[PDB]
Swiss-Prot record, chain A:
Changing H334 to E/F/N: Poorly reactive with galactosyl substrates. Less stable to heat than wild-type. Na(+) binds at F395, N398. The record marks H151, H185 as: Transition state stabilizer. Induction: By allolactose. This is Beta-galactosidase. Homotetramer. Substrate binds at E255, E331, Y332, A333, H334, N398. It comes from Escherichia coli (strain K12). Mg(2+) 2 binds at N391. The chain holds residues 208 to 615 of 1024 of the full protein.
Length: 408, 204
């Protein structure tokens, strides 16, 4: 169904069509450059101007104005319909899940004589995400991901998300010492990211690609005829969410094997947005399509030598010949019912091993749905209770909290 | 094959090995070893010595060996077991799972040691499983790790044979003696007996 918002948007003929924000820093994060690339559609005219202003609350910290026309990039010239403002910010207040300092970037498309044509805006978080010498660093410090996987689920409205439920989830997560959330396994409602920018959660933004049921799992993802479709799911995610500081990692999807389409789209992301690592678990969790060793349910000390996609002990995995990447479990500690036995072993390992930088628990909230008895009483239902067949009976309920957000 | 260089008693341990005035002496102990033993196939690894810290002389002689005989890796444990003077992470008495964070020369868990940022070398313990008396408790943990981890390629137990000496009672009967039984003072009493076999090669 139509399970997310439907809106009308009116823009001028001459409009802002896209805008990207990037933040660059010096060695100690005392100086930052906000680079705002603004694109326009419609009729170009020499009186058109773009002003990018940066605000800390009510205080203007930086501003920049320029006519359209970017620098020369190849033999045919540059983009006449683009302009890049480079604003300097001294001693920026850095964004993190601990201190979610945010600025406000306002992008004004106006005339030279000052008439405003339109204005767009975004929350800007000054932070650097990069993998250095095998460690995922945020603002120069190695992260320890206290993460959880979260589906968009409501027991009464299904997959329709509202602000109140999002806020409830974020509060509960932070109150239980989570600092990261994985969008399992699709781009979330837009507001989500904003809230995570505001409250301080690290986000893994995941393309809506899962082909788990294929045999083999990569039958489609290794097929060039499906590369267009997959591409749209990756590219359009990035184009939508790349300005959110909360998003620190891109994911190419989930449980779709490892095919050449993944490698291609990995490289596409790396080319268009080198500010964020890309991860992907499929095909053994350590393929060429991931910057992070991101296994699912790898155990601390016990190896699980499966053919072609073994799940090594995470400790062992780090030390395999030639392996230098950080290891962050995209899924671990399957919270199905009365579970999370052995969780402390994971966290002892995370704290002992530098390159074990945490993981994302599976998962936040039980995907149960409300049905009603003959006497009108509501009860929680799982696979098979709607006549759905075949079904995976109670495996929909893997949450740390009940569907009503009551904790387990 | 190990050069006859140990300066364990120096404070700091590298006082001589970091001193260029002792580079000639050290060099002779390394070079003349190689020149003597380089044709033996059994010798698979050169060692620059033992418990002499990490000084520039080690780096120099490491590179000398690598230049004259690139057929064998060079190892050296001093200065934290993972210095530039060793091709092999070769710690002494690093434990399987327990870290020993000593200042400037920590003894990480061998499993952890392999995975430290930037570390790619194999790990072979030059000394482990100190067989002093009734000992070798926990040996199986080492071997489980060795078999599970590819880059944990084993180690050298400390050590083969008790360094006891024979003395004789008033009645002419021989008995086994250790530090301090010859009037030697100061002495490290029974730490000379760390063997898997007695001095007469009877097994423990
Ligand atoms: Na860690
Ligand atoms: Na499930
Ligand atoms: Na091994
Ligand atoms: Na001894």
């Amino acid at each position: 169904g139509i399970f997310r918002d439907v809106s009308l948007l009116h823009k001028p003929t001459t409009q802002i069509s896209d805008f990207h924000v990037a933040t660059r820093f010096n060695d100690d994060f005392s100086r930052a450059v906000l680079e705002a690339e603004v694109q326009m559609c419609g009729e170009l005219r020499d009186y058109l101007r773009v002003t990018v202003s940066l605000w800390q609350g009510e205080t203007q910290v930086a501003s920049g104005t320029a006519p359209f026309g970017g620098e020369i990039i190849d033999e045919r010239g540059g983009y006449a319909d683009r302009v890049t403002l480079r604003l300097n910010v001294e001693n920026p207040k850095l964004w993190s899940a601990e201190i979610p300092n945010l600025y406000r970037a306002v992008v004004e498309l106006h005339t030279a004589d000052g008439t405003l044509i339109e204005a767009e805006a975004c929350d800007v978080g000054f932070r650097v995400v990069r993998i250095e010498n095998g460690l995922l660093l945020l603002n120069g410090k190695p992260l320890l991901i206290r993460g959880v996987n979260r589906h968009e689920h409501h027991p009464l409205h299904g997959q329709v998300m509202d602000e109140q439920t999002m806020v409830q989830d974020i509060l509960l997560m932070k109150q239980n010492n989570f600092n990261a959330v994985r969008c399992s396994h699709y781009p979330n409602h837009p507001l989500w990211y904003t809230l995570c920018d505001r409250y301080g959660l690290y986000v893994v933004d995941e393309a809506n690609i899962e082909t788990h049921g294929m045999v083999p799992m990569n039958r489609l993802t290794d097929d060039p005829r499906w590369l267009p479709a997959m591409s749209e799911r990756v590219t359009r995610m990035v184009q939508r969410d790349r300005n959110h500081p909360s998003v620190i990692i891109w994911s190419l999807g989930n449980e779709s094997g490892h095919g050449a389409n993944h490698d291609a789209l990995y490289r596409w992301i790396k080319s268009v947005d080198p500010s964020r690592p890309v991860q992907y678990e499929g095909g053994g969790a350590d393929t060429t399509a991931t910057d992070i060793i991101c296994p699912m349910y790898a155990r601390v000390d016990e190896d699980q030598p499966f053919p072609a996609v073994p799940k090594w002990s995470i400790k062992k995995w780090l030390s395999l010949p030639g392996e230098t990447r950080p290891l962050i479990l995209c899924e671990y500690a399957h919270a199905m019912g009365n579970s999370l036995g052995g969780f402390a072993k994971y966290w002892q390992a995370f704290r002992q091993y530098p390159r074990l930088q945490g993981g994302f628990v599976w998962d936040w909230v039980d995907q149960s749905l409300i049905k009603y008895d003959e006497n009108g009483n509501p009860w929680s239902a799982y696979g098979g209770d709607f006549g759905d067949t075949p079904n995976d009976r109670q495996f929909c309920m893997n949450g740390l909290v009940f569907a009503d957000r009551t904790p387990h």
